[model samples]
Target: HMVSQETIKHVKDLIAENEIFVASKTYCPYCHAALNTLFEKLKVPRSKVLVLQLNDMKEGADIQAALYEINGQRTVPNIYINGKHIGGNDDLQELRETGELEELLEPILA
Candidate 1:
């Protein structure tokens, strides 16, 4: 199903409002891994992250549809850094492993 303009706007606004935004789901293991990498491993501050656990929301399915339109994927833990689509859990960990995650985040954190 196609998403509404309002849902599109809502997702855009979410990306606009945060440096690190994660489109997540409550029971998603990858989502949990992504969150853990950011919060526990990276020690990124809670205030700097915006995790939208869509499973808990009434409009979750619609939002996920909108996300597919926006990011080219509807998978949970669709992570964005400074509004740039950064892929999912594996991509995130790769960045961390290669030390690119810090480089990507330095300017934003600065």
Candidate 2:
């Protein structure tokens, strides 16, 4: 599940508590797939993560703009851990291959 109003507060709370946040969009296939990959392939638990999806809402666009400021590029699947800007889809895939994604997310999971 991406995000809904009912889960928005929960997701935001998770982001504040866990220190890792992946903000994406609902209509983005790449973003959705990457999210699934993170959990399925990387074995990250849903409890330790906050996945927010922008779905044509004003706040969603606002979030996207904020992410763009951090990365200097607006793309779906924007990944951030401990307030550090990781990157978008391809960038995250590269990080996973380099074995950096685990290092980045391990602390939070632990």
Candidate 3:
């Protein structure tokens, strides 16, 4: 309810520039689980992983407002890969076990 449209524009620009983006909250075990799945289990490189701890940002809530604007998902570990939302830790297992995660990460990893 308190977010600015200007900041929402900034969020859009950020996501558009980075194909792999995670709007996370530091110290959230769920976030770490999802992150661990990507970097550790999946072996995705840290250099390419674009992580932004919303809880650590000055515009955290506004960024979330921007996320809700674009994706309708305002949850932690909000993950976007290859220009789309795969927004949950449970979703990690779904894609990971199905081998879809690796394939989606193919553009950068391959």
Candidate 4:
């Protein structure tokens, strides 16, 4: 949890910069499913989404540590859309099944 201040700011900036951001690990199932829901179900463009594989980076754990403080989540596949935190796979799928996810993303899609 002892992440640096620069890392915290960097994470904050990354979240603000992207409309959709996912802090994910490559081997995680829920992470894959969350992405699938976005790409396959929602048909959100690959170009639009940014999934950072924290496991792929040496600084990933530090970033996640920063994110834990920033987002109140320490889990991989921490999801966000339109700069709003969306929780994770279950939350996302629930939104999708209820059609609320599409509704929330509708404005941006247009």
lDDT of 4 by residue, 1-106 (tens): 4889999989888888887888899889999999988998779888877889999899998998998898788798899888888988998988888879988788
Which residue pairs of candidate 4 clash? Answer: none
TM-score for all predictions?
A: 0.92, 0.75, 0.89, 0.92
Encode model 3's per-residue lDDT on 1-110: one tens digit a residue: 45687987787777777868888998989899999988888888888878999988888888888898788887888888867788879887799889888788899786
Give candidate 2 misplaced runs (Cα > 4 Å).
Answer: 1-17
- Candidate 1: regions farther than 4 A off: none
- Mark the 10 consecutive residues where model 1 has the least summed lDDT: 101-110
Clashing pairs for predicted structure model 3, backbone only: none
What lDDT does each candidate get? Answer: 0.89, 0.71, 0.84, 0.87
Model 1 TM-score? 0.92
Question: Each model's RMSD to truth, in Å?
Answer: 1.3, 6.3, 1.6, 1.3
lDDT of model 1 at residue 73?
Answer: 90
- Model 1 pairs in collision: none
Candidate 4 wrongly placed segments (more than 4 Å) = none
Model 4's alpha-carbon lDDT is 0.87
Report residue 40 deviation for candidate 2 (angstroms). 0.9
Choose 2 or 3, whichever is better by TM-score.
3
lDDT of 2 by residue, 1-110 (tens): 23355444543454466566788777888887788777888778876667777776667766666555445657778777776777777888888889998898788778
Q: Rank the candidates by lDDT, best first.
A: 1, 4, 3, 2
For candidate 1, lDDT tens digit of each residue in 1-110?
48899999999999988999999988889999989988888788879989888889999888889989998996888999988889899999999899999998887776
Model 4 TM: 0.92
